[PDB]
Each structure stands twice: as structure tokens, then as C-alpha cells.
Design an enzyme around this catalytic site. Structure first.
Site, PDB file in Angstrom:
ATOM      1  N   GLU A 100      97.886 -28.720 -45.311  1.00  0.00           N
ATOM      2  CA  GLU A 100      97.942 -29.472 -44.038  1.00  0.00           C
ATOM      3  C   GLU A 100      99.298 -29.499 -43.363  1.00  0.00           C
ATOM      4  O   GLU A 100      99.479 -29.217 -42.173  1.00  0.00           O
ATOM      5  CB  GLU A 100      97.289 -30.833 -44.033  1.00  0.00           C
ATOM      6  CG  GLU A 100      95.793 -30.954 -44.208  1.00  0.00           C
ATOM      7  CD  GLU A 100      94.896 -30.476 -43.100  1.00  0.00           C
ATOM      8  OE1 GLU A 100      95.515 -30.371 -42.020  1.00  0.00           O
ATOM      9  OE2 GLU A 100      93.683 -30.430 -43.203  1.00  0.00           O
TER      10      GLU A 100
ATOM     11  N   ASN B 207      96.749 -30.449 -30.171  1.00  0.00           N
ATOM     12  CA  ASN B 207      95.447 -29.769 -30.078  1.00  0.00           C
ATOM     13  C   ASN B 207      95.021 -29.618 -28.612  1.00  0.00           C
ATOM     14  O   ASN B 207      95.422 -30.417 -27.756  1.00  0.00           O
ATOM     15  CB  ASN B 207      94.408 -30.477 -30.932  1.00  0.00           C
ATOM     16  CG  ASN B 207      94.724 -30.604 -32.408  1.00  0.00           C
ATOM     17  OD1 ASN B 207      95.011 -31.730 -32.838  1.00  0.00           O
ATOM     18  ND2 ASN B 207      94.720 -29.471 -33.113  1.00  0.00           N
TER      19      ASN B 207
ATOM     20  N   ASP C 241      92.253 -30.599 -27.176  1.00  0.00           N
ATOM     21  CA  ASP C 241      91.684 -31.846 -26.678  1.00  0.00           C
ATOM     22  C   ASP C 241      92.660 -32.955 -26.309  1.00  0.00           C
ATOM     23  O   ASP C 241      92.131 -34.031 -25.951  1.00  0.00           O
ATOM     24  CB  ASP C 241      90.569 -32.380 -27.586  1.00  0.00           C
ATOM     25  CG  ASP C 241      91.113 -33.014 -28.869  1.00  0.00           C
ATOM     26  OD1 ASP C 241      92.318 -32.874 -29.147  1.00  0.00           O
ATOM     27  OD2 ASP C 241      90.371 -33.778 -29.515  1.00  0.00           O
TER      28      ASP C 241
ATOM     29  N   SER D 101      94.777 -34.434 -28.324  1.00  0.00           N
ATOM     30  CA  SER D 101      95.105 -35.150 -29.583  1.00  0.00           C
ATOM     31  C   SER D 101      96.235 -34.447 -30.327  1.00  0.00           C
ATOM     32  O   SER D 101      96.584 -33.277 -30.051  1.00  0.00           O
ATOM     33  CB  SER D 101      93.875 -35.369 -30.437  1.00  0.00           C
ATOM     34  OG  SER D 101      93.472 -34.162 -31.050  1.00  0.00           O
TER      35      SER D 101
ATOM     36  N   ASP E 252      97.814 -34.241 -34.441  1.00  0.00           N
ATOM     37  CA  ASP E 252      97.713 -34.535 -35.882  1.00  0.00           C
ATOM     38  C   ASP E 252      99.100 -34.930 -36.407  1.00  0.00           C
ATOM     39  O   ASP E 252     100.114 -34.311 -36.041  1.00  0.00           O
ATOM     40  CB  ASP E 252      97.252 -33.275 -36.596  1.00  0.00           C
ATOM     41  CG  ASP E 252      95.946 -32.761 -36.023  1.00  0.00           C
ATOM     42  OD1 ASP E 252      95.026 -33.510 -35.731  1.00  0.00           O
ATOM     43  OD2 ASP E 252      95.809 -31.529 -36.058  1.00  0.00           O
TER      44      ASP E 252
ATOM     45  N   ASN F  20      94.490 -37.314 -37.241  1.00  0.00           N
ATOM     46  CA  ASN F  20      94.246 -37.042 -35.813  1.00  0.00           C
ATOM     47  C   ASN F  20      94.241 -38.287 -34.932  1.00  0.00           C
ATOM     48  O   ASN F  20      93.532 -39.248 -35.230  1.00  0.00           O
ATOM     49  CB  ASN F  20      92.966 -36.210 -35.711  1.00  0.00           C
ATOM     50  CG  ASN F  20      92.684 -35.720 -34.307  1.00  0.00           C
ATOM     51  OD1 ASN F  20      92.027 -36.516 -33.606  1.00  0.00           O
ATOM     52  ND2 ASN F  20      93.353 -34.641 -33.951  1.00  0.00           N
TER      53      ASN F  20
ATOM     54  N   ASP G 120      84.299 -42.567 -44.805  1.00  0.00           N
ATOM     55  CA  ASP G 120      83.501 -42.403 -43.597  1.00  0.00           C
ATOM     56  C   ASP G 120      82.209 -41.600 -43.687  1.00  0.00           C
ATOM     57  O   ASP G 120      81.369 -41.797 -42.769  1.00  0.00           O
ATOM     58  CB  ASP G 120      84.334 -42.010 -42.377  1.00  0.00           C
ATOM     59  CG  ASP G 120      83.920 -42.721 -41.090  1.00  0.00           C
ATOM     60  OD1 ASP G 120      83.982 -43.965 -41.010  1.00  0.00           O
ATOM     61  OD2 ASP G 120      83.563 -41.969 -40.152  1.00  0.00           O
TER      62      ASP G 120
END
Length: 129
Positions: A35, A46, A48, A50, A52, A59, A101
Site C-alpha cells: 500500500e 484519485n 474521483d 479522493s 488515500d 480513502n 464492514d
């Protein structure tokens, strides 16, 4: 901070990640490796909008608030900036929420691509844990 493999392993252990939600410590170390390369300061932007953040590249669309991400949910209830600490607490706390989740560690693409199904125990061998 750039963590050493064994240093990280020991931090993650102390934070209760070993076997959390059925995932052995090696899983976590492996994820951190692919990562962020064990870098607490890593950020990635990113398509979109966003970003990280930190050692586990958490995110900004779902998890933390950075105030510049359209459709933000802040499910971890934290500022993204807290994810860039030298101290991994915040990141671990959020990661425990993410894994609980429903998709387990599939939330980490680098885990899915590079860790899952391998000898993740390799990541902790040679360490005084």
C-alpha cells in the site's frame, strides 16, 4: 516515518491486529508493504477527487474527512490528516472499522492483488514479536 518491517509488525501486534476479524498479523504487514511501502506519510490522489492517506492508504470518500472530497462519508469519524501521524493508532482504529464492514481485507486493493493467498507469515519471520 518509514517503518521497518519488524518494527511495524510489533506496532500492529500491540494494537491488536493479530488475528483481527480472522486475519493474521502477516496479512496486515503485507498490506502496509504494498500500500505505502511502510510510509506513514504516503498520499495518492484519485480520479474521483479522493485521496488515500497514510500507512494503510485509507480513502477520503468513505473513511476520513479531508474537506475537499465530493460525497465524503467520514465513516471513521476522523480528519484524514490524523492518518499521516508517525503513530499508527488512528490508522489502526480506522482499519478495524473498515475490515468489520463486510468485505474483510478486500478493501485494500494491494492486499487483494499481492497478499491474499500467499505465505503472509514471511512478513513476520525473523522478527522478535
Amino acid at each position: 516515518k518509514v517503518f521497518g518491517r519488524c518494527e511495524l509488525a510489533a506496532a500492529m501486534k500491540r494494537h491488536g491486529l493479530d488475528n483481527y476479524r480472522g486475519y493474521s498479523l502477516g496479512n496486515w504487514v503485507c498490506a502496509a508493504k504494498f500500500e505505502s511501502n511502510f510510509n506513514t506519510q504516503a498520499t495518492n490522489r484519485n480520479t474521483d477527487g479522493s485521496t488515500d492517506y497514510g500507512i494503510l492508504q485509507i480513502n477520503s470518500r468513505w473513511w476520513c474527512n479531508d474537506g475537499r472530497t465530493p460525497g465524503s462519508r467520514n465513516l471513521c469519524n476522523i480528519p484524514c490528516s490524523a492518518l499521516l501521524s508517525s503513530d499508527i493508532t488512528a490508522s489502526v482504529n480506522c482499519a478495524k472499522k473498515i475490515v468489520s464492514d463486510g468485505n474483510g481485507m478486500n478493501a485494500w486493493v494491494a492486499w487483494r492483488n499481492r497478499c491474499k493467498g500467499t505465505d503472509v507469515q514471511a512478513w513476520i519471520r525473523g522478527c522478535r514479536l
